Structures are given as structure tokens and as C-alpha cells.
PDB file of C-alpha atoms in Angstrom:
ATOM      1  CA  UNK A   1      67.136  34.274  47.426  1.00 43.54           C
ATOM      2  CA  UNK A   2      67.138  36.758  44.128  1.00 44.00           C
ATOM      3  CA  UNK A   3      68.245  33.666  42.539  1.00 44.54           C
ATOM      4  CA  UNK A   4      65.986  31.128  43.469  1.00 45.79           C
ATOM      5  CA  UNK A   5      63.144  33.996  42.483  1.00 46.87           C
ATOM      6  CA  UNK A   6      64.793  34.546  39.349  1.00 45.51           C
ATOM      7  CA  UNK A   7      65.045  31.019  37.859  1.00 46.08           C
ATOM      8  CA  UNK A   8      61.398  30.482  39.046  1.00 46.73           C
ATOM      9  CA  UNK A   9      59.964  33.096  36.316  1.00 45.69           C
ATOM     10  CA  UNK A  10      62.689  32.204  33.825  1.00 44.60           C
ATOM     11  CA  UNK A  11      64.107  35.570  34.207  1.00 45.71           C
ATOM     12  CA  UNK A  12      67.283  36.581  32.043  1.00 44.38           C
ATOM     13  CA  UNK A  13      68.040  39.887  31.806  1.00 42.21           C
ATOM     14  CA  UNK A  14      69.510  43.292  34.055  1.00 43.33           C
ATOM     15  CA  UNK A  15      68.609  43.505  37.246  1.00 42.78           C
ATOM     16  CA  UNK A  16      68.994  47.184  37.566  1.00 44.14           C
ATOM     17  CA  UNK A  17      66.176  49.275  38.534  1.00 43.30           C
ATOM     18  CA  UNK A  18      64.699  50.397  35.281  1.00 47.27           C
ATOM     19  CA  UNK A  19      61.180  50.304  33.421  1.00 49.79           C
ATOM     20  CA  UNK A  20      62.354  48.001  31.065  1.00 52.89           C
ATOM     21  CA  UNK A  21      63.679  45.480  33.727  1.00 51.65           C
ATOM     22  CA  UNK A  22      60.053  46.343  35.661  1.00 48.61           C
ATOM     23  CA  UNK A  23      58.136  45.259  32.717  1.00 51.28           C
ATOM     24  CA  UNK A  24      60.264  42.112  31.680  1.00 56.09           C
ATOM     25  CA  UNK A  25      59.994  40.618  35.494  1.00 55.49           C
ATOM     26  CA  UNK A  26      56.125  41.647  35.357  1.00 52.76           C
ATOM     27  CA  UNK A  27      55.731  39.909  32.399  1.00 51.52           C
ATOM     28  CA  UNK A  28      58.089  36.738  33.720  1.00 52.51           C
ATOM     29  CA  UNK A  29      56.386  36.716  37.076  1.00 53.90           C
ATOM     30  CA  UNK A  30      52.627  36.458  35.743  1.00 47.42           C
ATOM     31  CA  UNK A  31      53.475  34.023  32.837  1.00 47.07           C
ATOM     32  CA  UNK A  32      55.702  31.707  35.616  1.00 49.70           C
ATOM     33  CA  UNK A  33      53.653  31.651  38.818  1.00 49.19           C
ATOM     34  CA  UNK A  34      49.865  30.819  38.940  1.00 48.30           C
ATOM     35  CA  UNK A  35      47.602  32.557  40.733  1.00 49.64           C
ATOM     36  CA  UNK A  36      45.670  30.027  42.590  1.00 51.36           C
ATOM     37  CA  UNK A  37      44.012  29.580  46.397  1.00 52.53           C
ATOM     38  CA  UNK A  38      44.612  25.797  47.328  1.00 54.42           C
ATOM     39  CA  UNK A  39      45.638  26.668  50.689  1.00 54.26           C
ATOM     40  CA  UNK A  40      42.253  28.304  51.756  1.00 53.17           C
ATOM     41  CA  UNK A  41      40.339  25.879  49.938  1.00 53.82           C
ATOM     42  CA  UNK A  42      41.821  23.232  52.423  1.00 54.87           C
ATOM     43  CA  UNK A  43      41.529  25.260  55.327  1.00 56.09           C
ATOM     44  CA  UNK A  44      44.722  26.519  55.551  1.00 54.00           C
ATOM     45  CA  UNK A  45      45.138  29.890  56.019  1.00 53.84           C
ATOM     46  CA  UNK A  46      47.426  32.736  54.318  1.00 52.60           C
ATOM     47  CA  UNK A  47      48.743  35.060  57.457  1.00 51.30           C
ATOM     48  CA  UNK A  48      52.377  34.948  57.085  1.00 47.93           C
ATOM     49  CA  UNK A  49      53.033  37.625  54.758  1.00 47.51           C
ATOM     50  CA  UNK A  50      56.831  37.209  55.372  1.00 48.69           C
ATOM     51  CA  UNK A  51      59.939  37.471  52.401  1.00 44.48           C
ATOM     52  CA  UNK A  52      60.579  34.049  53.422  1.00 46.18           C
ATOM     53  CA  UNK A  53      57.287  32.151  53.982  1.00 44.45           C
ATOM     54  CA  UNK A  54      56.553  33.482  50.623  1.00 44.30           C
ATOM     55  CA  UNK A  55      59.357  32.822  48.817  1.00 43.79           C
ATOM     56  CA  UNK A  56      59.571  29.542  50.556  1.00 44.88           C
ATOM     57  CA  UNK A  57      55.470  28.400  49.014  1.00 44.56           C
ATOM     58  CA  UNK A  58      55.789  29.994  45.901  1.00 46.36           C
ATOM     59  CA  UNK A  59      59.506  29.774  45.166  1.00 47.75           C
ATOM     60  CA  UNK A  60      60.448  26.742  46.815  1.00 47.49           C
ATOM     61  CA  UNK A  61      57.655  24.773  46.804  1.00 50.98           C
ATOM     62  CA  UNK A  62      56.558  25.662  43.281  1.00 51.66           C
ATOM     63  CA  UNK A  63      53.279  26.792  44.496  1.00 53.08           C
ATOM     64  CA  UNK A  64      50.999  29.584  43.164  1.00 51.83           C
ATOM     65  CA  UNK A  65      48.899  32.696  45.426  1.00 52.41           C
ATOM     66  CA  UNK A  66      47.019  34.928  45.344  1.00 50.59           C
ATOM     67  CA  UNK A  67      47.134  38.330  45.747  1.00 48.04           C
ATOM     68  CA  UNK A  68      49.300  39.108  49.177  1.00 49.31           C
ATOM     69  CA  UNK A  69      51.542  36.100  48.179  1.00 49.93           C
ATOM     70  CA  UNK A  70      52.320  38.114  44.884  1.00 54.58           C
ATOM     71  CA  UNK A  71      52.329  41.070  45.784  1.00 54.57           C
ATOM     72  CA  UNK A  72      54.124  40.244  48.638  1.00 55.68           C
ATOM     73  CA  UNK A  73      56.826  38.033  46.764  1.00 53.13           C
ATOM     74  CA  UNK A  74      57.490  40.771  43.728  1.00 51.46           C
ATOM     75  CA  UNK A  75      57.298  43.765  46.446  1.00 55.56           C
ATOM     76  CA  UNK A  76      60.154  42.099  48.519  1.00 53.76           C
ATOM     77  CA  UNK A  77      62.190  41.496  45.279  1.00 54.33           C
ATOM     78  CA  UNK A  78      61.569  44.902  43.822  1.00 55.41           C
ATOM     79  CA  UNK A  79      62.647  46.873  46.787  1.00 52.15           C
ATOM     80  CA  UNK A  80      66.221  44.014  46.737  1.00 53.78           C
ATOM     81  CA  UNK A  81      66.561  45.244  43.558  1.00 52.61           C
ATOM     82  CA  UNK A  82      66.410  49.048  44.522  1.00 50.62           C
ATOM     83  CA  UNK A  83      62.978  50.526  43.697  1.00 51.68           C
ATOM     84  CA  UNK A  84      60.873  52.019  45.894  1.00 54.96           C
ATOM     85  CA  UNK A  85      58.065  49.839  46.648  1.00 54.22           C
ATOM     86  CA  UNK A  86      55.188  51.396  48.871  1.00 55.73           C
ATOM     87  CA  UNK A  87      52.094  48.738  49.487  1.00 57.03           C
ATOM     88  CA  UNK A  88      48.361  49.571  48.913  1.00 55.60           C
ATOM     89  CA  UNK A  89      45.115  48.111  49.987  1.00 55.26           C
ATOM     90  CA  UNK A  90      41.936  47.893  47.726  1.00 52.85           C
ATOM     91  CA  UNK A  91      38.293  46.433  47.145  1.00 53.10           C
ATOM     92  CA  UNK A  92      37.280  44.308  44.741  1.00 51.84           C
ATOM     93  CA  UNK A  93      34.563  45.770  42.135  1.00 52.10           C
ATOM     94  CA  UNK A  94      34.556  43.175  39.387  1.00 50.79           C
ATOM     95  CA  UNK A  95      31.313  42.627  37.366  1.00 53.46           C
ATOM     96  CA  UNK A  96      29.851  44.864  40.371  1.00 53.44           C
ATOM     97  CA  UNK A  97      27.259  47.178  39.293  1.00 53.64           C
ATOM     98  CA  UNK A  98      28.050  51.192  40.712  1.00 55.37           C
ATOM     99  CA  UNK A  99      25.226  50.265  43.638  1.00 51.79           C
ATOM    100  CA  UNK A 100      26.708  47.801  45.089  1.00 53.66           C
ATOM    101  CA  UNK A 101      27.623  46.813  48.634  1.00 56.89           C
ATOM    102  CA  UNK A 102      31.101  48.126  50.133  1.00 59.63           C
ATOM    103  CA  UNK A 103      33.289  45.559  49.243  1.00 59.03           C
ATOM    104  CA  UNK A 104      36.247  44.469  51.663  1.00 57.10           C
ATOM    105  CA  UNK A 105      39.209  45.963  51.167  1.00 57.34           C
ATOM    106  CA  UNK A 106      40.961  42.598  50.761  1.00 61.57           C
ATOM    107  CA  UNK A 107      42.913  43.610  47.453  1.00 60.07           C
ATOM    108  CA  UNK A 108      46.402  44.400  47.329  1.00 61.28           C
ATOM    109  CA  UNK A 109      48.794  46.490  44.857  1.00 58.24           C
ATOM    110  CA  UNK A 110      51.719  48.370  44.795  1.00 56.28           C
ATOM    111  CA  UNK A 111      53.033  51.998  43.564  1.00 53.11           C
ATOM    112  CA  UNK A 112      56.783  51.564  42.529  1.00 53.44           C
ATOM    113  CA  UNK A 113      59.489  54.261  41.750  1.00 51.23           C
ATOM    114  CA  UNK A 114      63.106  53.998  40.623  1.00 49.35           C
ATOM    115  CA  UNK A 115      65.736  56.426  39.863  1.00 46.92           C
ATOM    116  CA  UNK A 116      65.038  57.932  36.654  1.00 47.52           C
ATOM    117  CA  UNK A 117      61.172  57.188  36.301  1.00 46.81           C
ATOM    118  CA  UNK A 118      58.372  59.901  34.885  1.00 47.44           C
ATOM    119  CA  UNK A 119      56.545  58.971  37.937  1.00 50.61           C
ATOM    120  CA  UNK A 120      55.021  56.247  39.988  1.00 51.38           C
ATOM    121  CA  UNK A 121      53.930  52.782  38.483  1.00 51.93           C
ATOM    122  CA  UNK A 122      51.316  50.452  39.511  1.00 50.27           C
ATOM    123  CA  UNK A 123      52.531  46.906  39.932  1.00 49.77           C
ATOM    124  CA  UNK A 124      49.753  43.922  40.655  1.00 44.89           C
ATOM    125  CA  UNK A 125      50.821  40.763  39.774  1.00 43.85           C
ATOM    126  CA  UNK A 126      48.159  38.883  42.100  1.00 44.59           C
ATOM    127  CA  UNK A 127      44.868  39.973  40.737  1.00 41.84           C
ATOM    128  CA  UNK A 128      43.283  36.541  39.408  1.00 46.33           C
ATOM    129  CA  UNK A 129      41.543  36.576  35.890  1.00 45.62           C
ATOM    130  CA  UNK A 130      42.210  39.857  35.088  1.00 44.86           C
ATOM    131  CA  UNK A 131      45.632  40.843  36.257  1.00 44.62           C
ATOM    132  CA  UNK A 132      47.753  43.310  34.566  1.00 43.87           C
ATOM    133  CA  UNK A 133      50.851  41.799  33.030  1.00 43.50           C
ATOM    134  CA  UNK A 134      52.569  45.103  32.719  1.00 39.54           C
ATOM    135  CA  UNK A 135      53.625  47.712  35.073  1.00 41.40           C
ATOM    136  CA  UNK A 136      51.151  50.441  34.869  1.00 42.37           C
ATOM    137  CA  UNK A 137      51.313  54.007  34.818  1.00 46.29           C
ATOM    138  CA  UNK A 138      49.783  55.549  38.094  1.00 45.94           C
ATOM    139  CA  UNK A 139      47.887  58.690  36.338  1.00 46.73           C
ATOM    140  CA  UNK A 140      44.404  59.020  35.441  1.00 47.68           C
ATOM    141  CA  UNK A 141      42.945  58.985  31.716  1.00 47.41           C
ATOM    142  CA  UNK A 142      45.570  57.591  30.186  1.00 46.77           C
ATOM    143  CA  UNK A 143      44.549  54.479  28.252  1.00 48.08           C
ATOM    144  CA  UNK A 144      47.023  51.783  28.466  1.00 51.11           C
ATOM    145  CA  UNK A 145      47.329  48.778  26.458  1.00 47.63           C
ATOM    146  CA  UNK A 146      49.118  45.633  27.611  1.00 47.77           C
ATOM    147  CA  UNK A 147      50.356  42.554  25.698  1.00 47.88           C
ATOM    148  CA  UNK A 148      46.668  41.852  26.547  1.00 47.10           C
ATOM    149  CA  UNK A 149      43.912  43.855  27.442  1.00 45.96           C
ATOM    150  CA  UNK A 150      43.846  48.187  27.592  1.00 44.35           C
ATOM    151  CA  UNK A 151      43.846  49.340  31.025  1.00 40.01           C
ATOM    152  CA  UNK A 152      42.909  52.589  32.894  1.00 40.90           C
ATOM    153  CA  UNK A 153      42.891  54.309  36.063  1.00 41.03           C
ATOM    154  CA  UNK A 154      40.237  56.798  36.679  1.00 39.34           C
ATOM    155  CA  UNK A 155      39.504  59.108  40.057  1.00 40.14           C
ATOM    156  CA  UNK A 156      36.926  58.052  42.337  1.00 40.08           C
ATOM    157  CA  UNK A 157      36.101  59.250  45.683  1.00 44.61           C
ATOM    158  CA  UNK A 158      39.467  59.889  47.390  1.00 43.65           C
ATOM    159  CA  UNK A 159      41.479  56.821  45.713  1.00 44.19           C
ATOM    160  CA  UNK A 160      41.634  55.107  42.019  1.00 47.98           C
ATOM    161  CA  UNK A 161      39.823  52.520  40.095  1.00 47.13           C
ATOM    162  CA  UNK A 162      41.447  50.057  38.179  1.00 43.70           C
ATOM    163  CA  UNK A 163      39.686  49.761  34.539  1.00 44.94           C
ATOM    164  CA  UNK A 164      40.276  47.211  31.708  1.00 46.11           C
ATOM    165  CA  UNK A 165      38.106  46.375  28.406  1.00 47.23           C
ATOM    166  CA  UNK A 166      37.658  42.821  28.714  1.00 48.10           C
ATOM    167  CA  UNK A 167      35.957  41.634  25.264  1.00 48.98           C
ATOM    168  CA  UNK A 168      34.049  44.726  24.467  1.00 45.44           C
ATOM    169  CA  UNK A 169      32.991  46.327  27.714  1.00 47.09           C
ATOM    170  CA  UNK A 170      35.224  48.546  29.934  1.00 48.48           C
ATOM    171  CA  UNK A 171      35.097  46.772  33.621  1.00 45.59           C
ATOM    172  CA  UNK A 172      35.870  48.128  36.759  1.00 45.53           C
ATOM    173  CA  UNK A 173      38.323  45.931  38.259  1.00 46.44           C
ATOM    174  CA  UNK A 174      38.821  47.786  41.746  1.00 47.83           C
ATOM    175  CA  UNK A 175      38.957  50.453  43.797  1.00 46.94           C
ATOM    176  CA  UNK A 176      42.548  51.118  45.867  1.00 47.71           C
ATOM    177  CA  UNK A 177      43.992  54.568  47.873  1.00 50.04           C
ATOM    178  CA  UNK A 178      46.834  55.740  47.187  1.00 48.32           C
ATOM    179  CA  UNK A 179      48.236  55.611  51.299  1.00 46.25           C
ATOM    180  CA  UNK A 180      50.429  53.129  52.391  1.00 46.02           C
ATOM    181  CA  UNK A 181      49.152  50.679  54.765  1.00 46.17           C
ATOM    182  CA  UNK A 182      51.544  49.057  56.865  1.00 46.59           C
ATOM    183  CA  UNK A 183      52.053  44.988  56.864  1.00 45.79           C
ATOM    184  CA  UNK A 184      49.639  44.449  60.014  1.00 44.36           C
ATOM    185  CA  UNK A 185      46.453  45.775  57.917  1.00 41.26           C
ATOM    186  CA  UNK A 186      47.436  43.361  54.646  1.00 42.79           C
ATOM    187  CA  UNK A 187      47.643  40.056  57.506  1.00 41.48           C
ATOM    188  CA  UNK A 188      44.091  41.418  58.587  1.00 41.92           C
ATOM    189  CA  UNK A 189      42.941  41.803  54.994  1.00 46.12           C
ATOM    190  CA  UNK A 190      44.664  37.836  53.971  1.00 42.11           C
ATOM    191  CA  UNK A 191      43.233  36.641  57.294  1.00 43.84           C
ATOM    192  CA  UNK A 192      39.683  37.191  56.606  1.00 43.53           C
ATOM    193  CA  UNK A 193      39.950  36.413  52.937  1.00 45.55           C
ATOM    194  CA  UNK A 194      41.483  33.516  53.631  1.00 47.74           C
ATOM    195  CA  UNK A 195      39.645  32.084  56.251  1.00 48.38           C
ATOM    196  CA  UNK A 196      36.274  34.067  56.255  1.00 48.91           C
ATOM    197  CA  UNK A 197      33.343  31.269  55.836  1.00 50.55           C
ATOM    198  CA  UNK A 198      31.814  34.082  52.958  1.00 49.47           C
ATOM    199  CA  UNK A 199      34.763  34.718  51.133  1.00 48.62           C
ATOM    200  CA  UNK A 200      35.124  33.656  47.593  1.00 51.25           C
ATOM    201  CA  UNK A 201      38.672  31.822  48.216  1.00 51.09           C
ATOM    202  CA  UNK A 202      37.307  29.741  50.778  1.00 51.86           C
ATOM    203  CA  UNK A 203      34.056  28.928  48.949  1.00 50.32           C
ATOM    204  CA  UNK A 204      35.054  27.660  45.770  1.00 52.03           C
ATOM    205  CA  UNK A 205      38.266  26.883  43.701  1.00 49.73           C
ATOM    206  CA  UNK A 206      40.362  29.724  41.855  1.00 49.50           C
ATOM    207  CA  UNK A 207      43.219  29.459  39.639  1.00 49.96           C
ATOM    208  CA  UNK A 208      44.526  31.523  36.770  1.00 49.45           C
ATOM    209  CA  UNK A 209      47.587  32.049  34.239  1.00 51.15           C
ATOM    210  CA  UNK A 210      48.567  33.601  30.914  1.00 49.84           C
ATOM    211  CA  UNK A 211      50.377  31.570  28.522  1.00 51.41           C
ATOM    212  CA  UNK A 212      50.672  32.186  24.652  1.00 50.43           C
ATOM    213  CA  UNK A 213      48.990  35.618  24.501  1.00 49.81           C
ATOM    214  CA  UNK A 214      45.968  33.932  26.386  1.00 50.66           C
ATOM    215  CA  UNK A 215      44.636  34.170  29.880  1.00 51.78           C
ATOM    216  CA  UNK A 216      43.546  30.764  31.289  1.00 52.78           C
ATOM    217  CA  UNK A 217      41.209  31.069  33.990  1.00 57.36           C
ATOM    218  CA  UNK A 218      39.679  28.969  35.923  1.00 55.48           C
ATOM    219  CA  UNK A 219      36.575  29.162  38.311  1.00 52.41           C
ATOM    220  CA  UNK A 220      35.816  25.367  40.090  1.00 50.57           C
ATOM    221  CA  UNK A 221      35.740  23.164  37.077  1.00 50.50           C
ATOM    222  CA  UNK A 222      34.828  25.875  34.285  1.00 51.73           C
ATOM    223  CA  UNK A 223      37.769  26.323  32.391  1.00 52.06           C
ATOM    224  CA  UNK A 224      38.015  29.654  30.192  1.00 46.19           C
ATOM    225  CA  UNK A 225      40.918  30.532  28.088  1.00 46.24           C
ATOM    226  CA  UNK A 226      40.547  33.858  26.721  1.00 43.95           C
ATOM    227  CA  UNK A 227      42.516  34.066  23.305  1.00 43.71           C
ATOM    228  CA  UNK A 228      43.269  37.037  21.023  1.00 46.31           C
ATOM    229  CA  UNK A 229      40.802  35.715  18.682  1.00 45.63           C
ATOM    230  CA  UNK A 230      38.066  34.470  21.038  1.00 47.83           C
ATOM    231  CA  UNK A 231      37.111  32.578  24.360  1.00 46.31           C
ATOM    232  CA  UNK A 232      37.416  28.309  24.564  1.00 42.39           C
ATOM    233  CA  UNK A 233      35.389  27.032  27.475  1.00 45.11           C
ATOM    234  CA  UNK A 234      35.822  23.618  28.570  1.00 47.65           C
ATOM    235  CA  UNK A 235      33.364  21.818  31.531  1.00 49.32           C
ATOM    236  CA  UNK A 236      36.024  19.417  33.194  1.00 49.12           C
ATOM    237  CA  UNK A 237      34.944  15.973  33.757  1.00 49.05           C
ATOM    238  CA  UNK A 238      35.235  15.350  37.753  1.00 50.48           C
ATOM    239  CA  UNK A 239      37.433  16.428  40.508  1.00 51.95           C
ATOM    240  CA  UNK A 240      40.456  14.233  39.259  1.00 49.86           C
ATOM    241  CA  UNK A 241      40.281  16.370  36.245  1.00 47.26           C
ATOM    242  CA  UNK A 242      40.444  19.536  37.969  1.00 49.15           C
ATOM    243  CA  UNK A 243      43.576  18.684  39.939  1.00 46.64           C
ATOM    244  CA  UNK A 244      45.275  16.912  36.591  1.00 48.51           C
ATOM    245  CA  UNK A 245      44.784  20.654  34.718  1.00 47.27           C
ATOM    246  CA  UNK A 246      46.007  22.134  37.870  1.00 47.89           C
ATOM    247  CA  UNK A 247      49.219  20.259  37.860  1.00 49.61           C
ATOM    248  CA  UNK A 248      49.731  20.507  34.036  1.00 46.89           C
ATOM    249  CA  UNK A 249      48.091  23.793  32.704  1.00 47.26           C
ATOM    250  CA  UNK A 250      48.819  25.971  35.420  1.00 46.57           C
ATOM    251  CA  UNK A 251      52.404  25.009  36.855  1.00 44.72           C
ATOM    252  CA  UNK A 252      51.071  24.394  40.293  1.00 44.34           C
ATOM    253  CA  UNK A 253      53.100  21.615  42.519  1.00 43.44           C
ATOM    254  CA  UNK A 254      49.606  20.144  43.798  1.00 44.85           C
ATOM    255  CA  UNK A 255      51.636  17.330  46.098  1.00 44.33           C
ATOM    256  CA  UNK A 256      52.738  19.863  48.178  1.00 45.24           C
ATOM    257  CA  UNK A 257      48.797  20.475  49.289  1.00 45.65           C
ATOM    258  CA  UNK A 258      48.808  16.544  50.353  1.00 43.49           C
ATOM    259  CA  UNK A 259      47.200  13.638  49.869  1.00 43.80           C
ATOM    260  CA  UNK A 260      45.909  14.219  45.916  1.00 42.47           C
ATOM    261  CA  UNK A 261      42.862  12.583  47.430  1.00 40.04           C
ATOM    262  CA  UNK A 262      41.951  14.995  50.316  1.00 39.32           C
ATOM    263  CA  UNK A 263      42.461  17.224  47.509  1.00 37.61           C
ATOM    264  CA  UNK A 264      40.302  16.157  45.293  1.00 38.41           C
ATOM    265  CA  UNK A 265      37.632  15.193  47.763  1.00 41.00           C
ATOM    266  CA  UNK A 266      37.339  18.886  48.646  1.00 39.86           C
ATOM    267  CA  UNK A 267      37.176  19.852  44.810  1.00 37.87           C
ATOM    268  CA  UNK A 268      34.448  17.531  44.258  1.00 36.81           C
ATOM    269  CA  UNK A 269      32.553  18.458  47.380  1.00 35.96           C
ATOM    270  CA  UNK A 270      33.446  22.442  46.444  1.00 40.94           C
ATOM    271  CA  UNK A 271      33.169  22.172  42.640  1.00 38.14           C
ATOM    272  CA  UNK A 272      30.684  19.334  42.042  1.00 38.37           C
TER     273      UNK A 272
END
């Protein structure tokens, strides 16, 4: 199923285990496959976590995720390929001031080695609106800049937080440890943020991609694409709308959710 994977993001080059071939399947993953959270929106839930329910959605069915479907997906193909791939769990701090409430830890990452490398690498391909395209180095101070935004990891407590200056203002993304948690806690972790009645993915819609040096992001029907040069927002018209830049802006196969017009019933109950 490298294959399949492989055509999905439009990936051409080696498939040895290198930093350069890291960094050219980070940056084909997150420019091919939207992050997006249709399935809890409708009710259905993310708890198989499996190579081939994954692979099957988001290869297959030309679906997006969000983050264990990514991370899931490019972890599985990584460790094919012959790095180490060791899976992390994190909370969300995004926009959160330093008071405020313990977050879930519904987030997931991973630190990747390979013969040859200076030392681990972050890899998160399924962080929605703010993901890094770019393997990362795992070390602290270091600021490093993307094909987007600079990132940097700083110490806190006894784990990491994820930085990144979006516009002008350095924002703490999240907060992860460095352990590896096995599979069982990341099905807890997608169970409850896929089917919790508070969480954000059930709540509202979701959906983000990068495309021409831009992020497009989308929260219900505020659309936001974040350019080099500055931020177009756009205030789509009704549900129909919503679905139609779905489809067409971010890559997603929305016919494989169902009937377009259960769909768009729930975006214009959700979003309107």
C-alpha cells in the first residue's frame, strides 16, 4: 500500500530513509491530504487507528483527518520505509492564555530517527491551521523556519511546547512528552475527541490545507487563507457553499460522507 500512499501526495522521489526524503513526503503529505473532521461532525466516530482503516479513508477514499488519521497514516509509512517512528500524546494550547484550564491530551505527534540523523525529529502532519509542513528538529531554542511560518520548541514542565510566530506574535501551539504512549491511549484520546458532546470536532466544522505558499483554513463557514503577503477572509454564502469549497479547495471526496444533503443539513444547522 506504499504505492497507493505515494500517488495520493504526488510523491516522486527516494524512498530511503533520509532527511531529505522526510522533508519532501512532509511537505507532499500536508499539501495532498486535508485536514478536515467530517466524520465526527456526522456522528461518526474516529476509533480505528489501524494501517488499513486509515489508509483505506484517507488513501482510498480520498478523504482528509485529523490528527490520529495523519499521524497515524505517515507514522505507519515512515516506519515501512525504515525510520524509527515512536508516537506521542499532547494538549492543545492554541490562543490559550498561560492560566488556562488543563487541556485534554487529545493531540498527537511523532519523534522520528533514521540511520544517519543528528538526532530525533518531530513529525506532525495532523495539526489543523497551524501544522508544521516540515520535519522539525526535536531540541529546544532553536528557531526554525519552514516554507511557512518559524517554529520552536521550548521546555516546560516535564515535556515540550510547540511554538510558531503566526503574523507577528509567537503562539503556543501545544504541549506534548516526550514518552511513548502505546496505541490503546491514542483510541482513548480519538474516542473522546471524536465523539465527546464538548469537543471542538464534534461542535463545529474544521478543515484546513496549504496550497501556493498559503494556509487555507477554515472554521464553519469563515474561510481564511493566510498568504505570504497578508490574510483574505471570505464569509461563505450557506451550507451548499461550504460543502462546494470543501470538495474543490480542499481535495476532500465529500460523497463518500453521504447524501450531500444530510451533509449539508448538519453544516447549516452546525455553521449557520
Amino acid at each position: 500500500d506504499l504505492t497507493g500512499y505515494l500517488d495520493r501526495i504526488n510523491y516522486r522521489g527516494a524512498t530511503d530513509p533520509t532527511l531529505d526524503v522526510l522533508r519532501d513526503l512532509v511537505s507532499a503529505h500536508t499539501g495532498a491530504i486535508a485536514f478536515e473532521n467530517l466524520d465526527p461532525l456526522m456522528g461518526v466516530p474516529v476509533d480505528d487507528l489501524s494501517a488499513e482503516a486509515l489508509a483505506d479513508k484517507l488513501v482510498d477514499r480520498r478523504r482528509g483527518g485529523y490528527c490520529y488519521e495523519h499521524n497515524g497514516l505517515i507514522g505507519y509509512v515512515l516506519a515501512e520505509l525504515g525510520y524509527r517512528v515512536r508516537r506521542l500524546a499532547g494538549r492543545v494550547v492554541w490562543l490559550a492564555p498561560p492560566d488556562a484550564p488543563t487541556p485534554a491530551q487529545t493531540h498527537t505527534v511523532l519523534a522520528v530517527t533514521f540511520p544517519g540523523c543528528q538526532g530525533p525529529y518531530l513529525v506532525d502532519v495532523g495539526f489543523g491551521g497551524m501544522t508544521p509542513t516540515a520535519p522539525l528538529r526535536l531540541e529546544t531554542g532553536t528557531v526554525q523556519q519552514t516554507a511557512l511560518e518559524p517554529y520552536r520548541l521550548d521546555d516546560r514542565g516535564d515535556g515540550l511546547v510547540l511554538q510558531a510566530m503566526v503574523r507577528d506574535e509567537w503562539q503556543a501551539l501545544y504541549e506534548f512528552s516526550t514518552l511513548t504512549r502505546p496505541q490503546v491511549d491514542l483510541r482513548v484520546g480519538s474516542w473522546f475527541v471524536s465523539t465527546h458532546p464538548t469537543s471542538h470536532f464534534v461542535t463545529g466544522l474544521m478543515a484546513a490545507t496549504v496550497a501556493d505558499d498559503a494556509r487555507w483554513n477554515l472554521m464553519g463557514r469563515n474561510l481564511a487563507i493566510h498568504r505570504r503577503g497578508g490574510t483574505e477572509k471570505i464569509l461563505l454564502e450557506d451550507a451548499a457553499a461550504v460543502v462546494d469549497t470543501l470538495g474543490d479547495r480542499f481535495g476532500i471526496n465529500v460523497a463518500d460522507v453521504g447524501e450531500r444533503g444530510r451533509l449539508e443539513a448538519r453544516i447549516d444547522k452546525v455553521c449557520f
